[PDB]
Every structure is written in structure tokens, then in C-alpha cells.
Symmetry: C6
Subunit: 95 residues, 6 copies
């Protein structure tokens, strides 16, 4: 796979997170690299790919959870992070 | 057992979670694979099975906690996740 | 002791939790098997016994904390959980 | 020292907790056996002693933090817990 | 250094905490002995010194963060804690 | 690199945090030294540099997340912390 764009969707609840997480990977060719628990209820999900692929993922992921549980927080794409920032980005999630 | 659909119910409180967790397994043939603490008070419960089995579980689990403690958050079914997503799904809960 | 019913009281604060925890064990013959911190402020307390014993525990535990600190969240009894669910139930609390 | 009554004060903030914690021990002869972080912002402080000693502690501790930071949550005394309950009570706090 | 008074400022956010933490040490001769995360968003910062030194620290620290981020929670001085209470006070923060 | 000014942006959500984190490093020459989870939903991001560099970073980082997810909390610069304070500042984030 090996694109490096970043898709991110932030939710309130893990349940919306997991639909997001899944609709995203069903959408385009992304890699789910992280699911984090931020405290306070937000959960983020994070996937990497090429730019087209990651643009689609997030769109699809957005309108999939927007009404699941307590809903969507943000949904956002950095087509190319800076190497400085990959030091806080996970490689693969913790199962 | 070995179905792979996913049942998920998100709650506010562990106490509603545990009724959910139990009414679900009493309902159909599902496996309780996870109970997670999301921070901020939501707790999720997660079970796997075949599709029929997991459709029933969640329905039953929903109307069982909807009035327990602080109540139900979401209740949702992914009849078939993508392997990318099983990397954040637990296999069995932590006792 | 060795009943298997379940008593559960959910609170907002540990202080209400501990009165609950104590009035419960003073009430009937239950075993305090868990005190968990759910994040977000709820704390749950959990005890096992026979059915009569655990019915009484919770009643007594309820009206004991209902006005302690930030108060009672839920109070609820599963006279018989399913073995699937004992995989998230603790055996004895962590001191 | 070795009384076994229990004094408990629950706060919103550690800062009110620490004034409580200190005014309490200055008040009567109690032992500070625990300071716990409950998540969600409440912090509890817990001390043991004889009954007179622990009655005074809490009174003094109450009106000492009631206006510190975000304030007092509860303040409560179990003159004698049940041994079942000492399994969730700490022996000495974690420094 | 080795005074034993205690300065404490509680905040909502780490960012106000860190300005506090710094304006305090710039103010008088205190030792930053702790920065704790209380859950729920409050963060506390804690410094030791002589009494004059620690009185000044906190004043300076107060009006420095009162408008940073989500702001100041409390700000408070125990000129002399009881040894019972030093069992919950850290010696030096965790970097 | 090796400046020692400090840039800090506090957010509500990790997703705004990560845009901040990235726009900052794209802005000037800073080092991302930390991303912390404060509990309760705030997340902070922290970078070091020279003064000019770190002034720019934060400005850029501010108006980049102000509308991402749940948004910006604070945004703040200590051109020179005190060595006492570097004992709570991380050296490099945890990946």
C-alpha cells in the first residue's frame, strides 16, 4: 500500500469510531494505522494511503457515523505531514 | 461458534453495559469478545456471531439497558468488518 | 458463600460508592467482588451471593448513598448471568 | 494509632483535596491511608482512626476546602466498615 | 533550597499549568516538585520553598494563567503541611 | 536545531492537535518535543526552537485548527522557561 496522506475522524464514542474505521477501509485503499482513546470520550481513528484514496475514505467514513451513537467530532485530511509529525503518529494500532 | 458479524452497544455507565452484555448473550448465540472503557464514561460491549444471531443480540441488548443507570448511547451492527478493522477489535475481553 | 446472583450499584464519586459497598455487605450475605473506576466519574461496586441476599443488599445500598456526595447512578440485579458474561466480571477487587 | 473508623472527603480538584487531607490530620489523630484519583476530576482522601478522632477530622476538613478551587463533593464517615469492604480500602497512599 | 511551605495552582489545561509552573519559579525561590494530571482536565502544579518565597510564587503564578487557555481553578498555600500529608506529596515531578 | 523557546497549543480533540502539530512544523523551524493527553479531552502539543521560529509556529498552528473538530483551547509562548520547569517538559514525544 504505502501512501503517506493521513485520514482522521474524531468521534464521541468508540462505536461511531468503529463504523467510521470500517466504512473508511471499505471505501478506498487506506491502512488503519491507529485507534486512539483520547480520554473524555473522544476516540480518533487514523489511516494512511495515497491522496485520492484517503480523500475518499474520510468522506465515506464521515457520513457513516454522523448519526451513530454520540456522533462525529471532526473529519480531516493532511495530504502530507512533516516528518517531525510522524513521531506522534502510530505505525499500527494496538489490538 | 465462529460467526464474524459484530454487535456493539455503547452505554453511559458500566452497569448498563453489563445488562446489555448479558441480555445480548442470553438473546442469541454471540461471543462476548470485549468490554472496553472509553474514558469519559462511555463503556462499549462487543460480541461476534453469525448475522441473524448478532441482529437479535443487539435488539435485545438495546431495550434492556435503555433505562438502566445513565442509559444507552448507541447500538449498531457491522455484519462484516474488513480485515483492516479487526486489528482494533479484541479477541476476548480482559477479565 | 458462593451464590451467583449479581448486585450492582453505580455512583458518581467513590465516596458514595464506598457507603454503598459497605451498607450492601452489612445488609445481606454478599461478597464484594469488585470496585471499578469507569472513568468520567462513575464508580461501580459489585457483589455476589444468593438471590434473596443480593436483592436485599442493593436496596439497602441504594437508599444509603442516594444523598452521599454526587449520588446514585443506577442500582440493578442480574439474578443469573450467563457464563459468557463472567469473562468481564472480576473475582475479587484490587485492593 | 490503629482506630478503624473511616473519614472520607471527596473533592473536585486535587488542590481542595490536599487542604482537606492536611486540615483533617491537623484536626484529630487520624492516619491518611489514601488519596485516590477517580477520573472525571473528583479526588478522594481517606483517613483512619478512632471514632471521635475521625468525626472531628472530617468536619474540619469539610469547612477547609469548601471554597478552595472547585470545592467539596461529599464528606462522610463510616464508623465501622465491614471486613468485606476493607478489600477496596488502601492501607497507605501511593506517594 | 529546602523550605517546606507548599504552593499549589490548579488549572484547566496543561498549557495554563505550564505558564503557572514557570512564572512561579521565576517569581521567588521555589522548587517545582510536581505536575499532576488529575483526570477530567484539571492539572495541578506544586512547589516547595520557604513561606515568603512560596507566597510570592503563587500570586505571580495566579495572575499569569488566569487568562491562558481554559484558565485558573484554584491557587492556594499551606505554609506547613503535616508529615501525614507528605505521603501524597511528590518529591520531584515525572519528566 | 536547539533553540529553547516553547510553543504550546491546547486543543479539544487529538485531530485538531495533529493539524496544529503539523502546521506548526511546516511554519517555522521548531522541534515537536511532545504531544500529551491531559485527560478530559484536551490534548497539548509542544515544540522548541529559537524565538522567531516559535512565534511563527504557534500563530500558524492557531489559525489552522481553530475550526477543526472541537477546536482550539489556548495557544501560548514562553520564550524562555526556567530550568526548574524543564523537569516537566518532555524531550521527545512518545510514538
Amino acid at each position: 500500500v504505502t501512501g503517506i496522506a493521513l485520514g482522521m475522524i474524531e468521534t464521541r464514542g468508540l462505536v461511531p469510531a468503529i463504523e467510521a474505521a470500517d466504512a473508511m477501509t471499505k471505501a478506498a485503499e487506506v491502512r488503519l494505522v491507529g485507534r486512539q482513546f483520547v480520554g473524555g470520550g473522544y476516540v480518533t481513528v487514523l489511516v494512511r494511503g495515497e491522496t485520492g484514496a484517503v480523500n475518499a475514505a474520510v468522506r465515506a467514513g464521515a457520513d457513516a457515523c454522523e448519526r451513530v451513537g454520540d456522533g462525529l467530532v471532526a473529519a480531516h485530511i493532511i495530504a502530507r505531514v512533516h516528518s517531525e509529525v510522524e513521531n506522534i503518529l502510530p505505525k499500527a494500532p494496538e489490538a
